[PDB]
From a paper:
We reconstituted the biosynthesis of the benzoxazole moiety found in nataxazole by adding two enzymes (NatL2, NatAM), to 3‐HAA, ATP, and Mg2+. We have determined the structures of both NatL2 (homologue of BomJ) and NatAM (homologue of BomN) from the antitumor nataxazole pathway. We show NatL2 catalyzes ester not, as previously reported, amide formation; the amide is a shunt product. NatAM catalyzes benzoxazole from this ester by a mechanism that we propose involves shuttling of protons to control the fate of a hemiorthoamide intermediate.
The NatAM structure was determined to 1.7 Å resolution using the Zn2+ anomalous signal. The asymmetric unit contains two monomers of NatAM, which PISA indicates form a homodimer. Residues 1–493 in chain A and 2–494 chain B were traced, and the monomers superimpose with an rmsd of 0.238 Å over 486 Cα atoms. NatAM comprises two domains, including a smaller domain (residues 1–70 and 400–454) composed of a β‐roll and two α‐helices. The larger domain (residues 71–399) has a central core reminiscent of a distorted (β/α)8 barrel. The zinc ion in apo NatAM is located in the centre of (β/α)8 arrangement where it is coordinated by His75, His77, His253, and one water molecule in an approximate tetrahedral arrangement. Asp345 contributes to the coordination sphere but with a zinc–oxygen distance of 2.7 Å, giving a distorted trigonal bipyramid. The water molecule hydrogen bonds to Asp345 and His290. NatAM, belongs to the amidohydrolase family that is known to hydrolyse C−O, P−O, P−S, C−N, C−S, and C−Cl bonds.
Author numbering:
A (entry chain A): 1 to 493
B (entry chain B): 2 to 494
Write the structure that this text describes.
């Protein structure tokens, strides 16, 4: 795939020193970064290349651009199959009758638990062609917003359809399976077992076997538990044994909601982080989604275990979640030295991407502390790249522009009014830009996106296949009448 | 003449926060005549005089969202400080940044001293520098959909900003800089810096000059820079001026954690109580920030039916804690005080109204665990109708209703961010911003189309601004040409 020199722009590395190079350069050979730094230092690396390699060198003039490492979104859910029903296309245009529901008002724990336990049934209701079309468009939207490495933490989609989508798109993907074996029902004093733990674990073992063979280096997998509410002691024990035996990372959602601790005590006799700790899951392998509603003992367990938190401050308000300011635990654990990364979470229609989440962290963590240095723009970038990659156990290959790492990078245009006179274009990007301002996306030295358009894929073709799949799934599986769906899709066209 | 904008989703920000899918706006000359469902507005077109119904300009807005023009009632022209104020001369790396100025609770001595130096710098800029910088600064607000702009104290010449607004075709509430005290660290009491009567005479001169304006686009509103820099005589003088001429009034108060202690030490009393003693806590008051208020001061604001302008998009990067440290502004909004959203300002482009609406939607909802506390339509009302009420301009602007000025925005809704969403304002708050404003109409006149000036050339405004900034920065701020010329030499086009 040959050599590429990207020169002249401001280069953000997200390396250990959070290095920024004005008039910087990145030299890539095949899939790897070979040199990054001042243009003059990188030109010395170009002159050291084999003559046959230097002769094929592609020079990209990035003088009116900012270069970033590819975003690593380690906490994401494929949910686009629910685009008509889940807070989606059938809502009234007026928001005035909206109610506090689902995750809002501290969490409707019965409704959340019941909803999560229904995923297996809905996944089985979609065809493999519907699953592939929805996955490919959903994952394209992440790639288009600069996500080069995507982490599944439990999707309403078929795992191997999402793996096939990632293979076709050219992006990196950490695949998972849906894992729920208990429900918290309103008529009961105790959790109701819905599945055999061994069956849930066999489903992940099948995925692990299928991606073990992948030759691209772009596909990994990571087991998750959907939510500690929907987790038996047997599933927790089984997950601990699986991640030890196969040397894997582990993910779950825990301390996500004000009402979680009381539901966990009532139905399981113990709170989320303590149940994980008794199974041996609170350790360096753990990425905890949200992880804000933790008492002092649970905070100390996370610190002692050197666990990881994925935080989604771009999307809490619109869900009615209070996982930032009600406890202030995640910023406090970050100050105490816990690894904290930024993720999008997900929804059934496009929501905040990584770029929007970086802005949210920069605004919100700094405002809470009355400190513009708590999250610097380069910290928000590290939290969406290098630190995220560390939580996913992919920081061997991705998350920073350093020699020997994968050539995964973004170009953003910096020639318009938003960037004028600013020596810190990442700051202008966090003020006034977002996902739609990502211009070029390169993964393993291959250009996947240029001018905001697919190079090897057509967004228009992915959209058409996604809409066709959504029509089939929505009318057949969700039982929304074709008479209500077809007119909406006809007005897109 | 008559213009019909039809087919899109129309947000009115009327008293019911009305949203019309497949809506229309009919304008005749400068005014809205009908707004509602496209079919209802076509009946209004048929009820027009036939000569008017003939010569109707039809704008197909079927793939667009229509909004009222944004009303940014709390803004400062600060672009003259682009080289020194968190500006163009900073290192590209942010890693050495320190907590300064407004951060860490507020450096009250430094803030007071800084504000008291504005008059000197305003006198140092030429009328031509003032006009060029004002016109570009105010263009950036217009390009981001601001149709009505409120000056709350600028580092610029008042008549230059009035001339800039007249030239651009936007609405402007002009003010003068007002500071007559400084908090000096070597003294136990405030130091009087100017005669109150002289400060008031400067505003009286502006009021006289804009009294004659025939456009209906120019008003004025006196402000006090900050209650730290305000003598009892200036407050009493302002109260008499706004009563005699029936004007609104604006100031910054309760902005910083360290304000109350500095106000007690140097003035013997906190900000809102000092305003109440002068008779300024009433329906005319727009209080900037207004978060660090005790229970008695909150009750004074409620009793007075005063107004708060909140800038949650920009607190974090300034190290301000005017949202979460006290929670007072969301609490006063819940209690039924008028609260609007504003950008505040900086010396380089920062968060516009679109970014501030997103911030409010995320941040107020997250604090309350309530996705309904600020609905997207509430964020819009806070940036339009409610802002106009605080500025006392809601007679003519802030909502799309019959008899109001034809001030509106068109945003394209045909890309991936909007696909299948019956609530394009929600998609706009998730994933769009100032740069996604397509068309801006003021009094029925198109000023911006496709994000470009219709009557003005953005490239020409930029070059005049850069020429003026070079002169002012080297001559008045005493930055060597050797530091300025290289930055200007790098400017993209
Ligand atoms: Zn270096
Ligand atoms: Zn050297
Ligand atoms: Zn219940
Ligand atoms: Zn087994
Ligand atoms: Zn293995
Ligand atoms: Zn095995
Ligand atoms: Zn136990
Ligand atoms: Zn504590
Ligand atoms: Zn999640
Ligand atoms: Zn590692
Ligand atoms: Zn530059
Ligand atoms: Zn001092
Ligand atoms: Zn002069
Ligand atoms: Zn003049
Ligand atoms: Zn001093
Ligand atoms: Zn008078
Ligand atoms: Zn008068
Ligand atoms: Zn007094
Ligand atoms: Zn109180
Ligand atoms: Zn202000
Ligand atoms: Zn309300
Ligand atoms: Zn009014």
């Amino acid at each position: 795939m040959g050599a590429r020199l990207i020169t002249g722009g401001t280069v953000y590395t997200a390396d250990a020193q959070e290095s920024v190079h004005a008039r910087g350069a990145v030299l890539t050979v095949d899939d790897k970064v070979v040199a990054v730094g001042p243009a003059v230092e990188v030109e010395q690396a170009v002159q050291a290349l084999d003559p046959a390699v230097r002769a094929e060198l592609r020079r990209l003039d990035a003088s009116r651009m900012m270069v970033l490492p590819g975003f690593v979104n380690a906490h994401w859910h494929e949910m686009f199959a629910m685009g008509f029903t889940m807070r989606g296309a059938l809502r009234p245009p007026s928001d005035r009758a909206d109610q506090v529901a689902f995750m809002g008002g501290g969490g409707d724990m019965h409704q959340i638990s019941a909803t999560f336990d229904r995923f297996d049934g809905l996944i089985e209701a979609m065809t493999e062609d519907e699953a592939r079309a929805i996955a490919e468009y959903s994952m394209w939207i992440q790639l288009r917003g600069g996500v080069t490495t995507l982490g599944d933490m439990g999707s309403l989609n078929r795992p191997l359809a999402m793996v096939e989508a990632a293979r076709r798109l050219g992006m990196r993907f950490s695949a998972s399976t849906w894992a729920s074996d208990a429900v918290l029902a309103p008529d009961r004093s105790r959790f109701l077992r819905t599945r055999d733990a061994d069956t849930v674990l066999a489903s992940f073992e099948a995925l692990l076997g299928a991606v073990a063979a992948d030759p691209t280096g772009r596909i990994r997998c990571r087991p998750n538990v959907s939510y500690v509410t929907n987790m038996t002691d047997e599933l927790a024990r089984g997950m601990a044994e699986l991640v030890e035996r196969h040397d894997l990372p582990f993910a779950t959602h825990v301390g996500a909601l004000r009402n979680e601790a009381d539901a966990m005590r009532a139905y399981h006799g113990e709170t989320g982080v303590r149940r994980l700790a008794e199974a041996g899951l609170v350790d360096e392998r753990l990425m905890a989604g949200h992880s804000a509603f933790l008492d002092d003992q649970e905070q100390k367990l996370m610190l002692a275990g050197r666990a990881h938190i994925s935080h989604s401050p771009g999307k809490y308000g619109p869900s009615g979640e209070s996982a930032l300011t009600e406890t202030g635990v995640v910023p406090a654990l970050r100050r105490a030295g816990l690894d904290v990364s930024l993720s999008t979470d997900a929804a059934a229609l496009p929501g905040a991407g990584i770029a929007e989440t970086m802005r949210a962290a920069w605004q919100m963590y700094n405002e809470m502390s009355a400190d513009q240095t708590e999250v610097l723009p380069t910290d928000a970038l590290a939290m969406a790249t290098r630190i995220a990659a560390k939580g996913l156990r992919w920081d061997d290959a991705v998350g920073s522009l350093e020699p020997g790492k994968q050539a995964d990078l973004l170009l953003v245009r910096t020639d318009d009014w938003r960037y004028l006179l600013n020596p810190r274009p990442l700051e202008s990007f966090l003020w006034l830009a977002g996902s739609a301002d990502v211009d070029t996306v390169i993964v393993g030295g291959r250009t996947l996106v240029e001018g905001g358009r697919g190079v090897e894929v057509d967004e228009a073709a992915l959209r058409d296949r996604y809409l066709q799949a959504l029509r089939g799934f929505t009318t057949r599986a969700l039982r929304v009448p074709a008479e209500a769906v077809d007119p909406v899709l006809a007005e897109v066209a």
